[PDB]
């Protein structure tokens, strides 16, 4: 049923209450204003438990801090230091994401496939 509904490409706000634990996702990018993308969400982590982030999401800001143009290290810092309640604005950018992962491409619903 769900898998040929388009994934929304509009910006979303996501609030994650993780205390003084990890957010539970990894990021890639951040060279030359390339952008910061979620690459891996850990099963069972706070980011997974939210239900509102996926691989291919761009992190557009964290607690009001704009990361579209962040470096990789400074995004990671922002993320780790964001505090207990972390307000992300994300936007799913599957074509952009797919250029980081090998053999991966974007289907008609906008889902990222890896062959």
């Amino acid at each position: 049923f769900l898998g040929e509904e388009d994934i929304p490409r509009e910006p979303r706000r996501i609030v994650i209450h993780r205390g003084s634990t990890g957010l539970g996702f990894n990021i890639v990018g951040g060279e030359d204003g390339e952008g910061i993308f979620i690459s891996f969400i850990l099963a069972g982590g706070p980011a997974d438990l939210s239900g509102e982030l996926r691989k291919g999401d761009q992190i557009l800001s964290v607690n009001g801090v704009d990361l579209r143009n962040a470096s990789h290290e400074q995004a990671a810092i922002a993320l780790k230091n964001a505090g207990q309640t972390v307000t992300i604005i994300a936007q799913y950018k599957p074509e952009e994401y797919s250029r980081f992962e090998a053999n991966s491409r974007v289907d008609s619903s906008g889902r990222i496939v890896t062959d």
Binding site: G22, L23, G24, F25, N26, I27, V28, F40, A76, K80
Partner: peptide, 6 residues
């Protein structure tokens, strides 16, 4: 390179 877990 690079991917960082947060």
């Amino acid at each position: 390179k690079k991917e960082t877990p947060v």
